[PDB]
Scaffold this active site. Structure first.
Site, PDB file in Angstrom:
ATOM      1  NE  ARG A   9      -1.011   0.318   6.869  1.00 35.14           N
ATOM      2  CZ  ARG A   9      -1.399  -0.232   8.017  1.00 35.14           C
ATOM      3  NH1 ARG A   9      -2.457   0.235   8.676  1.00 35.14           N
ATOM      4  NH2 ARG A   9      -0.692  -1.230   8.531  1.00 35.14           N
TER       5      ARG A   9
ATOM      6  CG  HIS B 123      -1.622  -7.129  16.641  1.00 38.46           C
ATOM      7  ND1 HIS B 123      -2.355  -7.747  17.632  1.00 38.46           N
ATOM      8  CD2 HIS B 123      -1.560  -5.818  16.979  1.00 38.46           C
ATOM      9  CE1 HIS B 123      -2.716  -6.848  18.532  1.00 38.46           C
ATOM     10  NE2 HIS B 123      -2.246  -5.671  18.159  1.00 38.46           N
TER      11      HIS B 123
ATOM     12  CD1 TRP C  17       2.789   7.289  12.466  1.00 33.21           C
ATOM     13  CD2 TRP C  17       2.292   5.203  13.132  1.00 33.21           C
ATOM     14  NE1 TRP C  17       2.153   7.376  13.682  1.00 33.21           N
ATOM     15  CE2 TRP C  17       1.837   6.116  14.115  1.00 33.21           C
ATOM     16  CE3 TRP C  17       2.086   3.833  13.339  1.00 33.21           C
ATOM     17  CZ2 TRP C  17       1.189   5.702  15.285  1.00 33.21           C
ATOM     18  CZ3 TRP C  17       1.437   3.419  14.508  1.00 33.21           C
ATOM     19  CH2 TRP C  17       0.998   4.355  15.465  1.00 33.21           C
TER      20      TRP C  17
ATOM     21  CG  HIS D 277      -0.276   0.017   2.528  1.00 33.03           C
ATOM     22  ND1 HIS D 277       0.365   1.134   3.015  1.00 33.03           N
ATOM     23  CD2 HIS D 277      -0.134  -0.942   3.475  1.00 33.03           C
ATOM     24  CE1 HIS D 277       0.872   0.865   4.206  1.00 33.03           C
ATOM     25  NE2 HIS D 277       0.582  -0.387   4.508  1.00 33.03           N
TER      26      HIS D 277
ATOM     27  CD  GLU E 274       3.119  -5.276   8.245  1.00 36.04           C
ATOM     28  OE1 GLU E 274       3.459  -4.541   7.293  1.00 36.04           O
ATOM     29  OE2 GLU E 274       3.626  -6.393   8.468  1.00 36.04           O
TER      30      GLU E 274
END
Length: 171
Positions: A54, A76, A13, A8, A74
């Protein structure tokens, strides 16, 4: 089986260097631009996407209407969600760099993450485009014996579970 995996577009961040897992952040303006650039550059295959904002948005801007699967999320990061990579404790930093023995408190182990991802890939019955995350693309590329780091908003095609076919980055 031919599978295309898309990392993505960027979020805040990424430029800030913070671990981004299940924290649901939106794409930045540039992240959306990266996503739009993928339109016309990806094959017209069935699309599946992580349900996180995202990833979903990248798929939409790239011209797809994917079915959502949290299995494509993704990893955790647990208590490490939002942690600056720079100040990560050595145990965690080496684990992530070597992609092994990573188990963040309140989170998902790398082993569980890999089982999750590979189980999902095994279930696919035909070539597809997968809108996902950096860690997912990394797990796949590493399992195929290659460096797994790719740019946000970029893609890779693989013949799962045998070899990498191509890496596609746009500017």
């Amino acid at each position: 089986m031919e599978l295309w995996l898309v990392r993505h577009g960027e979020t805040m961040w990424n430029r800030e260097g913070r671990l981004l897992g299940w924290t649901d952040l939106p794409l930045t303006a540039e992240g959306e631009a990266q996503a739009r650039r993928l339109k016309g550059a990806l094959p017209s295959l069935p699309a599946f996407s992580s349900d996180l904002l995202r990833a979903r948005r990248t798929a939409e801007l790239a011209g797809f209407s994917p079915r959502l699967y949290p299995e494509l999320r993704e990893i955790h990061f647990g208590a490490l969600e939002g942690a600056l990579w720079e100040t990560l404790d050595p145990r965690y930093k080496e684990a992530l760099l070597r992609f092994q023995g990573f188990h963040p408190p309140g989170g998902e182990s790398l082993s569980a993450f890999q089982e999750r991802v590979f189980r999902f890939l095994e279930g696919l019955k035909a070539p597809a485009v997968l809108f996902t995350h950096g860690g997912v693309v990394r797990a796949v590329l590493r399992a195929l014996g290659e460096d797994g780091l790719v740019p946000p908003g970029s893609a890779v095609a693989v013949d799962w579970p045998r070899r990498v076919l191509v890496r596609l980055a746009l500017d």
